[PDB]
Every structure is written in C-alpha cells, then in structure tokens.
Design a protein around this ligand. Structure first.
Ligand SMILES: [Ca+2]
Lengths: 297, 298
C-alpha cells in the first residue's frame, strides 16, 4: 500500500472508543479532513499537500474506517452514529492539543462534520462539507428518483447480515462500482490507482464492511433522528461553513444545495465544482483552492 | 428432489409468442389463473390451489421468466418483464387453453401483472383478486424514508445490471430465505413448507432466473411506473370486480388502508385483512382460500 502523503507523519491517536489513524502534515492552524464511503483518509492525497502549505493538516480515518479501530457496534449502531464519531474525533483532536480546529469532511466525514458542528460548535473555527446535504434532507427527499439514485442508503441500512452477506461475495466489484458510478466520468479514471488499492483493501475486510453498514444503519436511524430534532428545533450550525458540491454529484440531485444548507447553517457559502461526488480526487485543484480560500478567511 | 406439491394437478407447457409458460392445472369449472410473485414460483399456491380446484379449473402459472417458464430475452426497456408485456403473454397463454374470460388471483409481482391486465384488457377478467399489494405507482408515490427501508429491494433490484445480479450472487441462498423469512409474520421460515422453500431456493440459484427478477424490478421502477401513471392521470379505473387481500403484517399495509388506496384504482373493490405477513397463501392458507372461493363464486 503506497504512501500518498509523502512528508506527512503518521499518528495513531488513542481515544476512549479506539485508535484513530491519521496522516499529519504541514503547519499552521489545525485542519481536520474526514473522508467518507467507501474510502479512507487517502482520498485527500491530492489536496492535502496544498492545504499543508497553510495548515496543520490532520487526515484521519473515520472511526471504524481504514486503519482506525472499529468500536464494537450495538443495537442502535451507536459508535457509528455521526454524533458518536464526532465525539471520538473531538477526543482524538484533544490528544493532539487541538480543541479548536477547522474541519472539512466529504460524504460520511461531512456528516460527522456538520453533526460535530451542531453538537459542539465551539470546537470548530470553520467547517467545510463536500457534496452532502444533511442526512435528514436525503431521507425527507427520498422519492422514487432519489431512492433509485442513492439506493445504497436503504440497502446498506438493511439489518445485519443482509448487506454484509451480499457484499462478501465480491467486495472488489462493489467498492469499484460505487467509486465508478459517482464520478463525473462514470469510471475509475479520476482516482489514483494506488488510492483505489487503499479503498479496495479496506473494503476487503469483512469487519470493515460491517462497520460501513453500521454507519449506514446509523444513517437511517439515529443519525436521522438526531438531525430531525435539530431541524425541528431550528438548531442551525453557527460556525461559518462552506458547502462545496459536485455539479454531477449526489447532493445536487434532489435539491439546490446552498438553499438546503441555508436552512441548516446561519453562515454558509456554497460553490459548485465541475465534478462528480468525489470532489477532492475528481477536481483536486478546484477543491483545494476553494478550501484554502475559505479557511484562510 | 423437488416435491410435487399439487397432487392431482397436471403440468402444462403453454406456448406463447414470447416463450413457454409453465403451469400446474387441476380442477374443473370456470378458469382461474393464479399468479405468484417474488421470490417464489407457482408452488406458493400449493396450500390454497387444491381448495380452489374444488370449484374452479385452477391454472397455477410461473410468471414469464420465473420458475420453469421460459425467459424471453429482455431489452433496454426491460419490455418482456413489464407487467403490460407479462399480462399480454399470459393472456395469450390462457388463449392457448381456450380461456379468453377468466378469474385471476395474483400475489406480489403476479398481482402487479394482474391489475395491469385488468387495466389493459378488462374484458378478459371475470373477477380479479390481488394479494398484499398496492399499485406500483402507489408504492413509488409513497416512497419515503420508512417505505424506502422496508421495500429497499424495489430500488436495489432496479439498479442497472450487473450490480444487483453480482450482489445477489454473493449469497443467493441467504437472500431468498432472508426475503421469505423477513416478510412473514413470524420472521422465520416456519410458515413455509420446506418442500416449497426448496423450489424457491432452487429457482433462485440460477443466475439467469435472478437476472430476470431484476429485470422485473427494473420494469417496476420504470415502464411499469409510467404505465400506471398514465392510468392515474387518465382516471382509468379497474372495472372488474376486485378483491384486495392484504396481510395485517404485510407490505401493502402501512398507516392508510390498502382498500382506500384500491378504491382510487378500481370501481368495485372489496377488501379484507388477513392475519399474515406478506405470504398470505402460505402463512394463512385457509383464510386466504376461504376469501378467494367466496369472492370468486359471487
Ligand atoms: Ca454467506
């Protein structure tokens, strides 16, 4: 497995819920980058060096993902709720002395991120979310067209071991299908093959796949419930936030992303990028520049 | 190895322009076509077909592409697995038997064939029974978080090939037993005859059978939806007397009544809950049989 962050350190951050793996590089204000599904921290390998010019970049595997420990889940998928993940990552950042930091998340990590910003906004200077809407919004908009486009939201949320048993027949196919289908090009050409190897190898572990399902089960239940309470109480993210989304990505398919986020965030700017879902690998320069600009403000 | 679950029924291979329909046929009297759904075969009727054969010529057919029926080759629009095309094929199959006016009961996918047949060709039907469904249009219009989770397979199996095919191949035995068990009231396989499960298991073991089922669900997401949509917008209603049976623990039920939904689609519809999960004819064979013979004799 290639090192795609030459010059970055490697940290195993112990937390009460298990170790967080993270590549660490650069200097300046702390910036935490959170990947999503079905990826690992290495998805930032094209934009993290550019950010590392200006920030201490911390590129963490989510709890349960990549090389991070996998907290044992429970009946309510608690450790893989974005609330628990946010808590664990806050803990991890505290081990490094970062009690106030900037945060950019993509996909699942973007969901940890806005949930972190709702639960503990004092921890965040600025927040960027990449190609998501709040979990609540996906579910609330889940009509026929959207059920087809993000079927995996309901499929992977099916009770164990149904998704796990189907994914275990040919894990490589599924991780590759999900990577391909949500690029602008519809293939694996936007990805560095050494990165795909990271994704493929992470997905080959049956425990890692279970965790991903647990994350999706949390996404269907507790994460939705947590979001529901906030949107029905009018709790908005008070942290300055950037919402970046792909013109060909998931977030824009069932809503205008900046309109949705303005319901969720008191101070949100948005920009589309010509890209599928995987902004940091499909459009690395345009993404890194959007992030450098936002976080330098 | 595969039990004969219809003692006294013969076996017909009915030729159509689109391939052979397999059927068990038994009884005498007015013709009654029984249509199974997913992921079963005609043998799902094995507990109620003998009851019905008392008063009817009961034709228990595998849907096109299911069980032992031939699998017409699909196309880009999944046309042979649209309910319209399946209904046309079964209308032709019934014509081969000299049945141009018949009673029809369908469950699950077969119930979708059945109301689409009733919409397209109402003159072919004396009466229609649909077990544990709402029209495809209604499932998709009610698509929300809760329903998306419960009938996830409607969007999963409609994914472009070969995505569901490949995943189904990951553990087909588990998948078919899971689908069977998860939609029963008990939550396990105890309601099913083990010889029936082996039929469903063995049908599900063929990758081409599984592909056809995905084509069926792809049609269910696209063409089938569009065909239903047209009838909704045109105010077309099913004019055949209709019986809607649903499981109290079934898919069709939710918060609003299935019968209230079917009244938007049919002019003359009666409806009963049956203490059952999805698989009324196996979980509740006597109550299902009784409701069907009483409705179909009129
Ligand atoms: Ca297995």
């Amino acid at each position: 497995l290639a090192d795609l962050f030459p010059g970055f350190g490697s940290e195993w951050i112990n937390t009460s819920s298990g170790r967080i793996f993270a590549r660490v590089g650069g200097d300046g204000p702390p910036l935490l980058l959170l990947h999503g599904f079905p990826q690992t921290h290495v998805m930032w390998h094209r934009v993290a060096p550019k950010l590392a010019e200006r920030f201490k970049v911390i590129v963490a595997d989510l709890p349960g993902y990549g090389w991070s420990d996998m907290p044992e889940s429970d009946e309510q998928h608690t450790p893989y709720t974005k609330r628990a993940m946010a808590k664990q990552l806050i803990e991890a950042m505290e081990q490094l002395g970062h009690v106030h930091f900037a945060l950019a998340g993509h996909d699942r990590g973007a969901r940890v991120s806005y949930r972190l910003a709702l639960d503990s906004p004092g921890r965040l200077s600025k927040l960027a979310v990449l190609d998501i809407l709040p979990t609540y919004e996906y579910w609330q908009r889940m009509n026929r067209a959207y059920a087809l486009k993000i079927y995996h939201w309901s499929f992977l949320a099916q009770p164990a071991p149904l998704p796990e048993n189907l994914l275990g027949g040919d894990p490589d196919f599924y991780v590759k299908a999900k990577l391909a289908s949500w690029t602008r090009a519809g293939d694996l050409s936007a990805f560095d093959p050494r990165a795909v190897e990271h994704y493929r190898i992470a997905f080959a572990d049956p425990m890692r796949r279970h965790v991903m399902c647990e994350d999706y089960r949390a996404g269907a239940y507790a994460d939705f419930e947590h979001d529901k309470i906030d949107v029905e109480a009018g709790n908005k993210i008070p942290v300055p936030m950037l919402a970046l989304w792909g013109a060909s990505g998931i977030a824009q398919s069932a809503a205008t992303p900046l309109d949705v986020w303005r319901k969720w965030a008191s101070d949100v700017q948005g920009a589309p990028i010509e890209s599928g879902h995987f902004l940091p690998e499909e459009a690395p320069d345009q993404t890194a520049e959007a992030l450098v600009r936002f976080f330098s403000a």
